[PDB]
Structures are given as C-alpha cells and as structure tokens.
Amino acid sequence: GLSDGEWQQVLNVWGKVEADIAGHGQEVLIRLFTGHPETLEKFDKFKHLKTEAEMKASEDLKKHGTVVLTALGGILKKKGHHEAELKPLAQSHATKHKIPIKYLEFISDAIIHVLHSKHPGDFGADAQGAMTKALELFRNDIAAKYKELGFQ
Template sequence: MMADFDQVLSCWSAVEADYTGIGGVVMTSLFQQYPDTQKLFPKFAEIPPDELAGNVAVAEHGAVLLRKLGEIVKAKGAHVAILASLATTHVNVHKIPISNFKLLKEVIIKVFAEKVGLDADGQTALSSVLDVVIADMDTNYKELGFQE
C-alpha cells in the first residue's frame, strides 16, 4: 500500500503545478458525467453545463479539492485526523453521500491520466489509494450517523 502512495506522489508535482486548471477539469467532468452531483453544490447548481468549464468558482473549488487530496496522499495513510474533519463537514454542512466520492474517484483517475500523464500502473495505485480514503471516510460517515 505504501508503494501506491509513493507512486501517486511521484506525479503530484504536476498536479500542484496547476491545481486550479486540473481541479476545474475534475469538477467540470464530474458535473458533466454525473449531472445529479452538480445539484449537491448550491453555488454551482444553476450554472449551465456549457459554462462549467470556464467558471472560475468551479475551478477554485476543484483546486481546494486537489489541495486536500494532496494533503491526504502526502500523509501516506496517516490521514485519520484529516478525514475526520472532512467527513464532519461533508456530513453536517454539505450533506454529501459517500457514493459521490466513488464517482469523484473515477473522474479523478481519468483526468489525471489525461492531464498529468498518469500511466496504467499509476492509475491502479491512485485507485487503491482512493479506495482506502473512501473506506475510511465511510467509517467516519457511519460514526456520524449519516445514512444514504
């Protein structure tokens, strides 16, 4: 498992170099591939699909997401405190079902393959890392009493 974190980190400088650009692609792709997810973001809910890609707020949210993901990946599995805080806000404030993180996982892997050249082995490593993160988030969700 540690090798998976290391493999993901080996491409992370490319992600850090363009958090906003890549983050915008992640969020836009999520909303276009899974339109129901856009409704979970009140400030983005009314943006027409053809205006998502150029929306500064969407890109900035994507950058926030990728910075947090970077923090989680750099923790190399020691992410309990990071996820506890994240789960609390996503349950109590945003009310985001855990299933949406699984959709996001697929989008992130595809975008990283396209935008930072993540090869097949890297995609497998990223998938494994995100599976652990999502499972740990799910544990937090259950502890917080969140039901989908």
C-alpha cells in the first residue's frame, strides 16, 4: 500500500527508465545474471551467454529487457490496481517458466542497483523508499498467486 505521494515518486523515477528503456532493461538483466548465475539457467535463449561481454553484445537480451520493463511499467502505472495485468505474469512465471519468488526478489534489488548506477546522486532516499515499496507490492501480489497455485 502506497500513498499518493509515494506513487508520484515511483512514476517520477519511472520517467528516467522510459527515456532509455532498452539500456535500463539490458543492465537490469546483466546485473541479475552476473550476480545470480543460477537465474541464467531458466532462460534457454540466454544460457549460451558465458561472459558479460557476450551479454552486453546480445541484441536479443536487450530486446527481452525491453519486454520485461515495458510490462513492469504498465503494472506500476496502475498504482496498485493491477490484478488484470499481474495475473497472467504470475501464472506464466509459476507454471511455464518455473521462477521461484526468490528470483523476483533478486530482480527487484537489481532494479534499485541499476538506478543508482545510472543516476548517481539523482535517486534520492525518498525515491528509493517509494520504488522499493512498489516492487514489494508487486512481489507480494505475485506471491499470493504462487500460494494459490502451490508453487514453490
């Protein structure tokens, strides 16, 4: 649950992402894969990437970063009223991709890391607080759907 002022902060931060969605999406995925290499194994189309240089050179990885962040942005713009948008993603991630909730924690922290890395000094303490709460709400509503499905 976020206040109006917190949502305003989230959507202000998101304007930074929308100015370069592919570059942000690329770096989020690279941070996830390099920090948590077990996550790479869930992607049949990226498991061939052995080095970060290959990850950086991959145009398909940048494309997928755009898909991921476009979906997240659509959810965030709903300010918590995201049941219709979140349900298919919870279902596909539990039943088809088999993504444990832990990996959604990993990517949430990776988003925070990338924002500080690309906007040092321009991602303030209030903005970090509000973005963190928004990603927690996203993860928590996914977790509720995971429990319904019995997925661990």
